Amino acid sequence: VKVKFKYKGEEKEVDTSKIKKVWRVGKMVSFTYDDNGKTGRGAVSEKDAPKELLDMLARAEREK
DNA sequence: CTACGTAGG
DNA sequence: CCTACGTAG
User: Which residue positions does N6-methyllysine occur at?
Assistant: First the structure.
């Protein structure tokens, strides 16, 4: 149910509902996410990015 | 080793 | 300022 990525040498999983912001960098989907009020950072490839997330990205792009 | 987007302490 | 991320150049 969550986004799986690697950040600074480790695998992580975050529930989409935790995403704050998302944007595109080449083929990479980059983002920030809530970690208790603290702001995490994560990135994953679009091939490994899950629909919902891709959906958030689209809207964000559409908007702006 | 550079580029690309964006924010973090 | 500048790294971190995935992928290409």
Answer: 4, 6
